[PDB]
Amino acid sequence: SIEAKFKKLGRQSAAGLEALIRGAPIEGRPVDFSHGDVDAHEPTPGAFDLFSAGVQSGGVQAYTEYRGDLGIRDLLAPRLAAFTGAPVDARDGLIITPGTQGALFLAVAATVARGDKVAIVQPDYFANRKLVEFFEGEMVPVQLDYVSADETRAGLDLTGLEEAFKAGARVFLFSNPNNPAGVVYSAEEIGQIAALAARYGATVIADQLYSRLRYAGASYTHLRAEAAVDAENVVTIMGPSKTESLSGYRLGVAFGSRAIIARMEKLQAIVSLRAAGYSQAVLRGWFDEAPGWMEDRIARHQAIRDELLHVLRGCEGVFARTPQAGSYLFPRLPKLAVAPAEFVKILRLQAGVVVTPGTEFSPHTADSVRLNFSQDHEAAVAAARRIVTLVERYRA
């Protein structure tokens, strides 16, 4: 039934909160932590010049093959090969998409049929469950036991993954670094994921969107380079939307399995034809930015990461994993005198802070909220202090 299918995809007012609100607002600059601030951390220098050169070049840029401009795919494949530590095939193993979201949609569409079991991590990216269920697959959840003082692994329940595959799951989709928690899977976790997938003949979609924004002294392991895994059963997706602040151009890529990439190409034709022709041109600069630019960017984000962690952990009932790549923090809040959903509204009403409710990522992370901390440094820190002040005001 079309109606039920789509039901599953579904100023701040005080209405319904009048008996619950305590005190007056806390003055300060509003911060929307729901996504990155591309004014505080600008799009790659040079990107707009590349876009402008493409427009001037004209119809050759405006129209491309459905899988993406050939010249740009040929430029990108060596860069993406060097980054991930395994071969990339420009011609048949690489598609350019409308955002990494574009790639994710296509990748799930090309791999999940009606009734197929799909292993999905909890917590993980908001679209993952919704995609599986839109294509009438059956999610088999795999717990991420990320709540731990042991920060040498993400905490994936690998026995749970294996059991998912024993039960008939032939697809596994995950983000690395994890959105929302910012944890990165260890070498051993990725090795076992690779071995389990190969063992059961499962396809893996590895969403490495934020994997380039990797903090000093964090390790990162690319599933697609594992000796245990068959390269032709892995699709890796990533792009420049967040690390490089190019979200406004709407670009992503997917690479790996030729059979799956060929399916994603055929589908892209009828989903949106192509990634915007003119947008594609900015990818000529991707992984070829000025020396030290990415390194400074990672350093500026790491300073924000560390001060936000100091402020949040300063609150006695708050737990948060250290993010190891990307710009997400996922603090678990204490018992409050209001429900989690009510507190999110109250943060906006009384602190001018937007945060993402933890229920977007799993039904079992309801008392967490997600922050995207790619923000103005000082505004972000001041906002965080308002959050914890309100956590104290509403503490059960």
* CA 62 centroid distance within chain: 28
How many amino acids of this chain bind a second copy (CB under 8 A)? 56
Q: Could you tell me the CA-to-CA distances from 389 to 14, 25, 232, 386 in Å, in that order? A: 20, 11, 51, 5
In whole angstroms, give the CA distance from residue 252 to residue 68.
10
In whole angstroms, give the CA distance from residue 339 to residue 367.
8
Out of 33, 36, 37, 64, name the contact with Cl ion by CB under 5 A.
64
- SS3 state at 107: helix
Q: What residues between 4 and 23 interact with a second copy by CB under 8 A? A: 5-6, 9-10
For residue 305, state whether it binds Cl ion (rule: CB under 5 A).
no
Out of 31, 36, 41, 347, name the contact with Cl ion by CB under 5 A.
41
| Interacting partner of 335 out of Cl ion, a second copy, none (Cβ under 5 to 8 A depending on kind) | Cl ion
Q: What residues between 316 and 335 interact with Cl ion by CB under 5 A? A: 317, 334-335
- Which residues face 214 on adjacent strands? 325
Name the segment binding a second copy (CB under 8 A); options: 2-10, 83-91, 292-300, 350-358. 2-10
Judge contact between 177 and 206, C-beta under 8 A: no
| Interacting partner of 101 out of a second copy, Cl ion, none (Cβ under 5 to 8 A depending on kind) | a second copy
| Interacting partner of 2 out of a second copy, Cl ion, none (Cβ under 5 to 8 A depending on kind) | a second copy
Q: What residues between 98 and 117 interact with a second copy by CB under 8 A? A: 98-99, 101-102, 104-105, 110-114
| Interacting partner of 357 out of Cl ion, a second copy, none (Cβ under 5 to 8 A depending on kind) | none
**Cβ 315 to a second copy shortest distance, Å:** 29
How many amino acids of this chain bind Cl ion (CB under 5 A)? 15
Residues in contact with Cl ion, shown as a per-residue x/- string from 148 to 187 under the rule CB under 5 A: ----------------------------------------
Q: Would you give the DSSP letter of residue 153?
A: S
141: cis peptide before it, omega within 30°?
no
Residues in contact with a second copy, shown as a per-residue x/- string from 21 to 40 under the rule CB under 8 A: --------------x-xxx-
| Interacting partner of 83 out of Cl ion, a second copy, none (Cβ under 5 to 8 A depending on kind) | none
For residue 278, state whether it binds a second copy (rule: CB under 8 A).
yes
In whole angstroms, give the CA distance from residue 273 to residue 95.
12
For residue 276, state whether it binds a second copy (rule: CB under 8 A).
yes
Name the segment binding a second copy (CB under 8 A); options: 85-93, 262-270, 303-311, 322-330. 262-270
- Going by their DSSP bridges, the two strands 234-238 and 252-256 should be labelled as antiparallel
Looking from the CA of 243 toward its CB, the CA atoms found within 13 Å total 26
Sign of CA dihedral 275, 276, 277, 281: negative
- Going by their DSSP bridges, the two strands 369-372 and 356-357 should be labelled as antiparallel
- Whichever of 45 and 168 has its CB closer to Cl ion, that residue is 45
For residue 59, state whether it binds a second copy (rule: CB under 8 A).
yes
Checking 151-156 for CB contacts under 8 A at 24+ apart, the result is 151/183, 151/321, 151/322, 151/324, 152/186, 153/185, 153/186, 153/188, 153/189, 154/178, 154/181, 154/183, 154/184, 154/185, 154/186, 154/189, 155/183, 156/121, 156/185, 156/189, 156/193
**Cβ 260 to Cl ion shortest distance, Å:** 21
Maximum Cα–Cα distance across the chain: 62
* CA 21 centroid distance within chain: 33
In whole angstroms, give the CA distance from residue 155 to residue 158.
9
**Cβ 380 to a second copy shortest distance, Å:** 14
**Cβ 327 to a second copy shortest distance, Å:** 14
| Interacting partner of 287 out of Cl ion, a second copy, none (Cβ under 5 to 8 A depending on kind) | none
Element at 306 (helix H, strand E) = helix 293-313
Residues that bind Cl ion (CB under 5 A): 24, 41, 64-65, 69-70, 248, 250, 276-277, 297, 300, 317, 334-335
Residues that bind a second copy (CB under 8 A): 1-2, 5-6, 9-10, 35, 37-39, 43, 48, 51-52, 54-55, 58-59, 61-63, 97-99, 101-102, 104-105, 110-114, 127, 130-131, 134, 245, 247-250, 263, 266-267, 269-279
